[PDB]
């Protein structure tokens, strides 16, 4: 149906007006969105969620050129193209979207997040779920493969339980880097003493 467009990192009244004028609507959440519009690669919660879902991530020019044309244009020419950020992170946004379209990055993972992590637990939970993973709101107390805990040094006192039952402690970068690149490599993010 008509696009349900989410925005991140931008203030774009013109863009919103274009969405509206062309028969689309504003998405209330990543879960509800068909498209994400932004100006460059920005690791916001919305961006990571959209990427995890595989929805098109398009520049502001998509809407402006669509309004000029009088109809929503195909997304292809408007994919966000940010070579500086691609170089920095060692990834391709198009290739990561392709991976998200082929499979759910975190299916089969169960992930708990300790309270001091950034982004905070409920925001991590949104990202996790957008990648098809299972967010755990309660502390896990038994071992299962791919059941992991995202934590940080500040939260060491909160890791006694997962440490005992053998659940890996991972830095937030497991998700911040992994979801951006659409790779799940927990080994690389295990926290040392």
């Amino acid at each position: 149906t008509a696009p349900k467009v989410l925005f991140t990192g931008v203030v774009d009244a013109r863009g919103e007006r274009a969405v509206l004028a062309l028969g689309g609507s504003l998405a209330g959440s990543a879960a509800e969105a068909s498209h994400l519009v932004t100006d460059r690669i920005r690791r916001t919660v919305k961006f990571l969620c959209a990427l995890g879902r595989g929805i098109p991530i398009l520049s502001l020019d998509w809407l402006h050129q669509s309004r000029k044309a009088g109809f929503f244009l195909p997304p292809d020419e408007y994919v966000v193209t940010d070579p500086e950020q691609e170089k920095n992170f060692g990834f391709s946004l198009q290739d990561a979207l392709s991976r998200a379209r082929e499979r759910r990055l975190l299916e089969g993972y169960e992930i708990y997040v300790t309270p001091g992590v950034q982004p905070p637990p409920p925001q991590m939970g949104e990202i996790i779920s957008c990648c098809g993973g299972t967010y755990l709101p309660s502390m896990p107390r038994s071992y299962k493969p791919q059941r992991v805990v995202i934590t940080c040094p500040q939260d060491f006192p909160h890791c006694s339980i997962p440490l005992r039952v053998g659940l890996p402690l991972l830095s937030p970068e497991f998700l911040l880097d992994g979801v951006l690149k659409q790779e799940a490599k927990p080994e690389a993010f295990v926290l040392s003493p």
Binding site: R42, T44, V45, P119, P172
Partner: peptide, 4 residues
């Protein structure tokens, strides 16, 4: 919005 916040970036991370």
């Amino acid at each position: 919005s916040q970036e991370y």
